[PDB]
Ligand binder design. Structure first.
Ligand SMILES: NC(=O)C1=CN([C@@H]2O[C@H](COP(=O)(O)OP(=O)(O)OC[C@H]3O[C@@H](n4cnc5c(N)ncnc54)[C@H](OP(=O)(O)O)[C@@H]3O)[C@@H](O)[C@H]2O)C=CC1
Length: 417
């Protein structure tokens, strides 16, 4: 009576149909010209210009996310008082696409702040367009438009198109797979699965912690299947550690056949209480960590590079501003990596999965809240085979982003369409 519902993001034309105490617009390394024109034209809105950070793209994202984050915190008393609109202007460009991830943060902010409207607006070349102010003004008039795209005289909104035997699989019986966050509860599950499927496989599990006894004990059974498993105890935030890990991979082994990026963690707190330190700490593994991995494994002939993202990244979730923006960055990265592959610069197919709560994933366990989330969302703790099935189905479809939900269909579809 429960079924996986399974979704896939779409840019659609969808323009079928109160007043703001405040109007804020944030520009992500937009053109100087753009900045000035907008301020002049929109002097009834505050305009913030993020151009300021130095780092790789991930570094700049983490920085700007913190700036958005500190902005909300401050305006917190206002949000109580009255309505507000923030619009983020993201130019589609070489890497600036990734800032579109700020959408995870905006969705969480909306859940936590009743009277906030937050829109992310991606623009192919905003400076060149000087019709811009009316659109922003016009977009401000349709609050329910959360993600909006302007390119080629086109105005798109993001929404969810549904996706619809025994499953094909990506496994090479010999050859190397790593799972960052591999000693975590999901990385072990996928470890076993590889073990069952693989035959003579090599599985490199990595994380920060020294292994506890039970982990090694849990690990040892997988050694039983005849797969060879090595725990490399590295921090994905540390670019050099990642480098070594990949090289040892290279020196040690023929090649890499596959990567799951499963490193990360959520730390629940409302934006009002959260520290900068905690905020950065949950961004790190999924944002910088992911970049670092991607760039160190660039020269490998991969069959796949799959990110383990979350339903939080695309819906937001109360108390997970940081987890959602981290996860949204990964989603945005999936498309960005594919483009690179078309350039021929990167090898293998890239997918980001928006996972729901797993039945026996560690991290969270549903318990009493399970019920609200079923009542709030119609979602249930997702069983492991259902998950593995969705995992295999997601690969064959070959989309950069797959959103997976398990629960009662009509409730789910009703909330999301
Ligand atoms: N569990 C679930 O139901 C769901 C999971 N997901 C996502 O799937 C992935 C797996 O989740 P799950 O296994 O349940 O959660 P866990 O916390 O059990 O797994 C995360 C693992 O990542 C490791 N890790 C954390 N930070 C770093 C870092 N900086 N560098 C390297 N390793 C790191 C942790 O180990 P250590 O602390 O030793 O470094 C931990 O083992 C996560 O990214 C999660 O966000 C998404 C939706 C639902």
């Amino acid at each position: 009576h429960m079924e996986r519902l399974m979704l896939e993001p779409v840019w659609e034309k969808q323009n079928e149909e109160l007043s703001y105490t405040e109007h804020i617009i944030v520009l992500f390394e937009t053109e100087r010209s753009v900045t000035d024109s907008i301020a002049s034209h929109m002097k009834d809105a505050r305009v913030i210009t993020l151009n300021e950070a130095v780092g790789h793209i991930a570094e700049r994202y983490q920085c700007y996310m913190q700036n958005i984050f500190e902005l909300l915190q401050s305006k917190v008393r206002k949000l109580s008082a009255g309505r507000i609109i923030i619009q983020a202007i993201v130019p589609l460009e070489k890497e600036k696409q990734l800032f579109a991830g700020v959408s995870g943060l905006f969705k969480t902010a909306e859940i936590e702040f009743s009277k906030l409207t937050a829109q992310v607006i991606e623009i192919e070349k905003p400076e060149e367009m000087i019709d811009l102010h009316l659109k922003l003004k016009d977009d401000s008039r349709r609050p329910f438009d959360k993600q909006i795209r302007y390119e080629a005289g086109y105005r798109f909104v993001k929404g969810w198109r549904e996706m619809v035997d025994t499953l094909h699989m990506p496994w090479r019986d010999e050859g190397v797979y790593l799972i960052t966050g591999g000693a975590g509860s999901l990385g072990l599950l996928f470890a076993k699965e590889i073990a069952n499927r693989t035959g003579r496989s090599t599985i490199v599990l990595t994380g920060r912690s020294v292994l506890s006894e039970d982990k090694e004990n849990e690990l040892e059974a997988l050694r039983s299947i005849g797969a060879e498993v090595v725990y490399r105890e590295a921090d994905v935030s540390d670019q050099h550690a990642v480098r070594h890990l990949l090289e040892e991979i290279k020196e040690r082994y023929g090649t890499l056949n596959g990567i799951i990026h499963g490193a990360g963690s959520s730390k629940d707190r409302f934006i009002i209480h959260k520290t900068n330190e905690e905020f950065q700490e949950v961004l790190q593994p999924k944002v910088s960590g992911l970049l670092h991995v991607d760039e160190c494994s660039k020269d490998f002939p991969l069959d796949f590079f799959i990110f383990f993202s979350s339903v939080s990244g695309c819906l937001g979730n109360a108390g997970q501003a940081d987890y959602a923006a981290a996860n949204s960055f990964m989603d945005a990265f999936a498309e960005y990596r594919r483009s690179l592959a078309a350039s021929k610069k990167r090898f293998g197919s890239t997918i980001s999965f928006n996972w729901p709560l797993w039945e026996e994933g560690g991290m969270q366990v549903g318990a009493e809240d399970e019920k609200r989330m079923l009542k709030t969302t119609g979602m249930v703790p997702m069983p492991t085979d259902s998950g593995l099935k969705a995992f295999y189905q997601g690969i064959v479809s070959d989309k950069p982003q797959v959103f997976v939900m398990e629960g009662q269909l009509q409730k789910m579809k009703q909330k999301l369409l």
